[PDB]
Amino acid sequence: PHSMRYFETAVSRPGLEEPRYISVGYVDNKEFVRFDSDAENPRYEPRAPWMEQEGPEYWERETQKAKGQEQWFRVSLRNLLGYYNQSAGGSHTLQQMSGCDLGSDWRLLRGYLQFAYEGRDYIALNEDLKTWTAADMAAQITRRKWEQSGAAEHYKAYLEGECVEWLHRYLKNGNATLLRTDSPKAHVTHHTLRCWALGFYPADITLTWMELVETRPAGDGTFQKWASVVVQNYCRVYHEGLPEPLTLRWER
């Protein structure tokens, strides 16, 4: 159960400014690298400590790709303004998601290549990695252009090849960090019964007693969540961090 993603954004800027392009890589849902065109010297930067292991040629090579992508998004943004009849007086947003899912044996399960314009689906590569799904009539222009030039083949090679091979390397190199868990600490409060799970990592969790908040970052790399009810006839905490599930109720 492993994955890698690159989350890329270009946000245009009205006036003589060019767009701001940002790229973020994730390994098992955790940020590991970041590029930002607004930085003092734009370069890919390590964001997980197991990445400081990669030598200068790795960063030099990744940074070349980011610079390329920045130019690719500029041209694609200009094209999108034309397809949708928009003004460069406004800001516009182009996003990409790409990468791969692996099994517990480290084989490829699925590749992903998806674009959004203005925060909505524009075009995506289907799971077959051969055909495209377009979201609207404008995106069908892109789909026909890309079918005509066999664009999918280049993505399929990346997703089945380099995406997989480099994820193995990061999975190997980050093994001790990635295998780490932080167990929740839990407690119950009275108002409504509220069971809190605190300080846990990763963010997947089950609380059962019914209101339930969105899981939220504590800001130290851990997460929090809570669950509540109507009313000691009554909470269970499920987390891969735990020796076993926690079991509790109100304590006075």
């Binding site: 690159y6 790229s23 890589g25 690298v33 890919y44 990744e62 790709k65 980011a66 390329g68 992508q69 690719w72 041209v75 694609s76 094209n79 999108l80 397809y83 182009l94 990409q96 790409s98 674009f115 524009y122 075009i123 892109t142 252009k145 890309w146 030039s149 664009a151 280049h154 993505y155 990346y158 380099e162 995406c163 091979e165 480099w166």
Partner: peptide
């Protein structure tokens, strides 16, 4: 390891 995109939108 990131990717280079091919054809533009």
């Amino acid at each position: 390891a990131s990717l280079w995109n091919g054809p533009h939108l």
